[PDB]
Design a protein around this ligand. Structure first.
Ligand code: DCP
Ligand code: BAP
Ligand code: MG
Ligand code: MG
Ligand code: MG
Ligand code: MG
Length: 432
DNA sequence: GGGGTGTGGTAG
DNA sequence: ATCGCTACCACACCCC
């Protein structure tokens, strides 16, 4: 066990943290895109007619972890057994669950202890360990296959297991659903072959928002072609409110409050007005949802097609550690901040930037919260505090940055024993 | 309008 | 045990 005051803590935590991997992978894919396409000026204009193929692996970690499993799990069956990927056996996050598990209401992000409860008697949850190197290898095969096809004007990385692929259609070429369906079947077979048995699903549409919804409809192991002209009651009735991009749990609560708890997006489509939406969830998000219900992309969403090189540029850099934070005194907190700053500065130097503004943010145990929460080493319920500082001159100097971060910690007035998380942020980045 | 800071939501 | 990251938007609120 590597404690938070051990010099190896950050390394160990990031080696084990799947959410660290998700973010680091996305950042590296964006950086790859910027390097690979430096002499490929294949950005979309609003003149162009295009088709979107939104492609992602089915239950990615579970599939890959299953295919690469040890001989101890040789008889375990992906099509018949509920299978999850996680670290532990009780209050440990299910990173990915297969579609058998999902038939019982098990979801990604549920703790194993919750998921076990949802299975009937006679049915055992199979837990597999993370295989991070294999996740990366399968992703490499995925992106290689997409490039090798030589069919997309733009391949935009969304995650380790997910890409938005854009085909521009000339005016003189007539594109048909048959051609679109053949391409879906080609991609699916080629990825299945190239990854040695992982499945992908594909949503195919003439808008980003619809391609994403079509993808959800296609899962698992399928494809769906739904263009704006094909929108129907049956389609919209297949989706929950938080199936919309940008709508998570908090926005869902607001929409259920305002619109008398619509069961599906069809119910919301029947009941809403634009003015009422905007009042429920704000001007920008309201317009996004309204446009989404017509199968249309908001202007913010379209920027990634119109200028991907600008959109994928990194504008800030940070680390977040809100697990395993148990410090006894301020000396240890300071040493940890120093280690974090050292880490961040290596990243800042790799991208040849300086920073002109930094923030320290912390999580402090809520007054009424137990000293140790149900998840081992978890932050539990906390209040956040943050403070920022502008640096006179842009810098990458440890002496300046680490000293200011430590000073920021002191200003926030959190006793070390109550600290449950720290984030160190470089908010503004500057060239050379 | 120009400038600023702190908090919280979402995606993967 | 268990590994609750992190970029970036939107917003509420302050100043001249
Ligand atoms: N709450 C989550 C969500 C996702 N992931 C990781 C594991 C997932 O396998 C991977 C990709 O996420 P997706 O949301 O596409 O989820 P899956 O690929 O697991 O399932 P789906 O078949 O729903 O796409 O990211 C995670 O660790 N925790
Ligand atoms: C940790 C977890 C879970 C649910 C929520 C819900 C709302 C949250 C708001 C802000 C922070 C936060 C941090 C962790 C959370 C949150 C929130 C559960 O899905 C589960 O217990 C997770 O492990
Ligand atoms: Mg997915
Ligand atoms: Mg997936
Ligand atoms: Mg994904
Ligand atoms: Mg959503």
């Amino acid at each position: 066990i590597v404690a938070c005051d051990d010099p190896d803590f950050l390394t160990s935590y990031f080696a084990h943290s799947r959410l660290h991997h998700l973010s680091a992978w996305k950042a590296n894919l964006k950086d790859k895109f910027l390097n690979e396409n430096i002499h490929k000026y294949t950005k979309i204009t609003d003149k162009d007619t295009y088709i979107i193929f939104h492609i992602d692996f089915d239950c990615f970690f579970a599939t890959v972890a299953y295919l690469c499993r040890s001989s101890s799990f040789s008889a375990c069956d992906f099509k018949r057994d509920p299978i999850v990927v996680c670290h532990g056996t009780k209050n440990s996050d299910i990173a990915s669950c297969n579609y058998v598990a999902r038939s019982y209401g098990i979801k990604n992000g549920m703790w194993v202890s919750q998921a076990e409860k949802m299975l009937p008697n006679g049915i055992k949850l199979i837990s597999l360990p993370y295989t991070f190197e294999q996740f990366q290898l399968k992703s490499e095969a995925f992106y290689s296959t997409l490039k090798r096809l030589n069919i997309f004007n733009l391949i935009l990385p969304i995650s380790i297991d997910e890409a938005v692929c854009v085909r521009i259609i000339p005016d003189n070429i007539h594109n048909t659903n048959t051609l679109n369906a053949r391409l879906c079947e080609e991609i699916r077979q080629e990825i299945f072959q190239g990854t040695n048995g992982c499945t992908v699903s594909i949503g195919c549409s003439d808008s980003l928002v619809l391609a994403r919804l079509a993808l959800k409809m296609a899962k698992p192991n399928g494809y769906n072609i739904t263009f704006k002209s094909n929108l129907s009651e049956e389609f919209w009735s297949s989706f929950k409110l938080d199936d919309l991009p940008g709508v998570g749990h908090s926005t869902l609560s607001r929409l259920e409050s305002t619109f008398d708890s619509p069961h599906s997006l069809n119910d919301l489509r029947k009941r809403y007005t634009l003015d009422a939406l905007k009042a429920s969830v704000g001007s920008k998000l309201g317009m996004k949802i309204h446009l989404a219900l017509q199968g249309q992309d908001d202007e913010e969403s379209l920027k990634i097609l119109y200028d991907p090189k600008e959109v994928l540029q990194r504008k800030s850099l940070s680390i977040d550690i809100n697990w395993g934070i148990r410090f006894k005194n301020i000396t240890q907190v300071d040493l940890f901040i120093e280690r974090g700053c050292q880490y961040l500065l290596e990243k800042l130097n790799e991208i040849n930037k300086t920073t002109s503004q930094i923030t320290l943010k912390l999580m402090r145990r809520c007054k009424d919260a137990p000293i140790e929460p149900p998840k081992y080493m978890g932050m539990g319920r906390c209040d956040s505090f943050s403070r920022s500082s502008r640096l006179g001159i842009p810098t990458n100097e440890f002496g300046i940055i680490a000293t200011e971060m430590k000073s920021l910690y002191r200003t926030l007035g959190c006793p070390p024993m109550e600290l449950r998380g720290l984030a160190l942020q470089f908010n503004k980045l500057v060239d050379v």
